[PDB]
């Protein structure tokens, strides 16, 4: 028998890379022009949100076999 939950981790690294890319894109967008000092902060908030969401997705997938 082979691992059925190993697959849960398949897209994990690329998903995290996508989210981090997104955050770095937003930080870049903030820096192109003068903006409110909190502009960069709001992209960070969206990143943290996506990571918690991806981790919860992973937990859900694991339970789905176990």
């Amino acid at each position, epitope marked *: 028998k082979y691992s059925k939950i190993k697959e849960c981790f398949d897209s994990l690294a690329d998903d995290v890379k996508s989210l981090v890319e997104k955050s770095e894109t*937003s930080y870049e*967008e*903030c*820096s*192109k*022009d*003068k*903006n*409110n000092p*909190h*502009c960069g902060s*709001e*992209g960070t908030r*969206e990143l943290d949100e996506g990571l918690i969401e991806r981790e919860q997705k992973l937990s859900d997938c694991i339970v789905e076999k176990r």
Partner: antibody, heavy 113, light 113 residues
Framework: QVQLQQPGAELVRPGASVKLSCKASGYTFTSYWMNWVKQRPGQGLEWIGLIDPSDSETHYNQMFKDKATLTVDKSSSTAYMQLSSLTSEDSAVYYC??????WGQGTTLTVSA | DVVMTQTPLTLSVTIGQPASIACKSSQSLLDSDGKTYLNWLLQRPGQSPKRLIYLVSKLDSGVPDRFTGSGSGTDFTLKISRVEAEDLGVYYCWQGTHFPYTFGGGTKLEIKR
């Protein structure tokens, strides 16, 4: 898919006022300062002012101090610019631009009877 | 207000040839925050402006590396390594360091064929 949606045209009569809109989507509205730019037929670009959608703080080119008023509606992700006491000089294309990268298609304002 | 002065006013270039446009400001665009908000825009006729360069030398989204921005302080240059047919239109410098934001008068690029 950052998009800034402006109506193609507004026609209003001399003396009256107009309220131009710019509806944003594809990003977090409150994060970025929004510019407004005027361009007369065959001429260059003129900066009118900008607004911070998060707190409605504004910065104006003083040339437009008695002409333009900038506001936002966060419930609809819309930036507004109101132009008062219209004259033929106000006939122009008006752009909203989120920073310098993202531009609306412009509203052609015609001041005529 | 910061006066932005572009030279030349018009440029006629053979396809495949290089092109250079200069922008001079009446004051330094170096902000107390250490950044220099000099932008280059291109506007093809009947279209919204698009941004080619932000922060003096940084290529914006979609912009090919045929475009190079350089300079500092009060003197800036945009170079096209080799002009293509699609590059035609009006180029504007635009400073977003000092209020009010101000634009150069534009440099028209015509193609020779």
């Amino acid at each position: 898919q950052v998009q800034l949606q402006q109506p193609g045209a507004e026609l209003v009569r001399p003396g009256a006022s107009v309220k131009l809109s710019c509806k944003a989507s594809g990003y977090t509205f409150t994060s970025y300062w929004m510019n407004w730019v005027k361009q007369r037929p065959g001429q260059g670009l003129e900066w009118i002012g900008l607004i911070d959608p998060s707190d409605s703080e504004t910065h104006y080119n003083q040339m437009f101090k008695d002409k333009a008023t900038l506001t936002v509606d966060k419930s609809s992700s819309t930036a507004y610019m109101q132009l008062s006491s219209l004259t033929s000089e106000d006939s122009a294309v008006y752009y909203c631009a989120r920073g310098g990268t993202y531009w609306g298609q412009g509203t052609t304002l015609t001041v005529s009877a | 207000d910061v006066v932005m002065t572009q030279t030349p006013l018009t440029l006629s270039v053979t396809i495949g040839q290089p092109a250079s446009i200069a922008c001079k400001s009446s004051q330094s665009l170096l902000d107390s925050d250490g950044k220099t908000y000099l932008n280059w825009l291109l506007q093809r006729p009947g279209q919204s402006p698009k941004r080619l360069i932000y922060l003096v030398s940084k290529l914006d989204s979609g912009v090919p590396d045929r475009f190079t921005g350089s300079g500092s302080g009060t003197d800036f240059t945009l170079k096209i390594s080799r002009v293509e047919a699609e590059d035609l239109g009006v180029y504007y410098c635009w400073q977003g360091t000092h209020f009010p934001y101000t634009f150069g008068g534009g440099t028209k690029l015509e193609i020779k064929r």
